[PDB]
Design a protein around this ligand. Structure first.
Ligand SMILES: N=C(N)NCCCC[C@H](N)C(=O)O
Ligand SMILES: O=C(O)CCC(=O)C(=O)O
Ligand SMILES: [Fe+2]
Length: 338
């Protein structure tokens, strides 16, 4: 069996999708522009029909931890070298594939970014940054990126996290885990459903990991407030027979003094560690991880820094943009609170 739902494009289907993405790259200035953000979900209706059928059906299945699409061609010569930093990572060689990710994402929901992550970009980059090997962010390498719900701190966190592998020559694995429902006893389960846990914002929302500028400044105040004064929240929500999950291995904690909550979180850590499995996104593979059913991470790897490091494009997707209207800056798709 497979804990995720998988689709493999035929070469003709893959070529057609690539051609559509190239057409979009020709007609629009950028992926994050207001025009393409609005048009992408409608343009996505032109994608191969079998793919559209897969995305419409697979999103509605009860079981998958992710939707995986294999077989998008990528030419390393045309792509160019892996950028040394996310700031300069919008290279012409990666441009069509960024449009492709956006088109696929449009079939699943509304895309958005954060004013406090990678300068408010909607399509972001995952690549190893020299000197940042042992950090808690996605540009780490030598230190494993521990399992987490994406943006667990925030009620406006994505429903799906999309990852498109531009290159991954050494087959470094993305990690995944669902709710360990086969092992959680009912008392522990009960406690995890109660608002007895603290979840702070991760290091990607700190000013040090964004560019020096006077734009998207006030949104860092809300991040500080979530870090300093986290309100108690639940880890599990919804149906007891199929709970949704909100946890971060490195940023979760029990409510102060709450030893029963602590025991439940401790047990959850153990059970998630034991059931964590691997998904290798080879060059051209795309994954849309269900951020409510599963946590994810990335295995430790030795970075190359020779121009051919592992490199992903990434995007946040919500089923309903209006859920986060508090955090709207204006008419943009960039979230953050004061
Ligand atoms: N357990 C950890 N490390 N949690 C934080 C994960 C960081 C993900 C973030 N969007 C990034 O791009 O770094
Ligand atoms: O590198 C990966 O496969 C996933 C990285 C990740 O968890 C993220 O960017 O949020
Ligand atoms: Fe993540």
């Amino acid at each position: 069996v497979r804990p995720w739902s998988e689709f493999r494009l035929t070469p003709a289907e893959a070529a057609a999708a690539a051609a559509l993405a190239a057409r979009c790259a020709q007609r629009y200035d950028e992926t994050d522009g207001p025009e393409f953000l609005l048009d992408a979900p409608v343009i996505a209706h032109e994608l191969p029909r079998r793919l559209r059928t897969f995305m419409a059906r697979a999103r509605l299945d009860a079981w998958p931890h992710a939707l995986v699409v294999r077989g998008n061609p990528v030419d390393d010569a045309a792509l160019g070298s892996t950028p040394v930093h996310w700031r300069t990572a919008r290279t012409p060689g990666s441009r069509p594939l960024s449009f492709l990710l956006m088109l696929y994402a449009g079939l699943l929901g509304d895309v958005f970014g954060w004013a406090t992550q990678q300068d408010g970009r909607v399509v972001t980059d995952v690549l190893p940054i020299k000197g940042g090997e042992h950090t808690l962010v996605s540009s780490s390498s030598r230190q494993e990126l521990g399992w987490h719900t994406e943006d667990a701190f925030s009620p406006y966190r994505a429903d799906y996290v999309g990852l498109l592998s531009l290159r991954n020559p050494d087959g470094v694995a993305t990690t995944l885990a669902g709710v360990p429902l086969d092992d959680l006893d009912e008392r522990t389960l009960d406690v995890l459903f109660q608002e007895r846990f603290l979840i702070r914002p991760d290091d990607s929302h700190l000013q040090v990991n964004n560019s020096t500028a006077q734009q998207g400044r006030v949104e860092f105040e809300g991040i500080a407030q979530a870090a300093d004064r986290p309100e108690p929240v639940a880890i599990l929500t919804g149906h007891r027979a199929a709970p949704h999950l909100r946890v971060d291995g490195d940023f979760s904690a029990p409510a102060e003094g709450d030893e029963e909550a602590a025991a439940a979180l401790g047990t959850l850590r153990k059970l998630i560690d034991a059931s964590l499995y691997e998904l290798v996104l080879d060059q051209g593979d795309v994954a849309f991880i269900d951020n409510r059913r599963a946590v994810h991470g990335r295995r430790a790897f030795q970075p190359r820094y020779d121009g051919r490091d592992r490199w992903l494009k990434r995007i946040n997707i919500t089923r309903d943009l209006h859920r986060s209207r508090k955090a709207w800056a204006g008419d943009s798709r960039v979230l953050g609170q004061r």
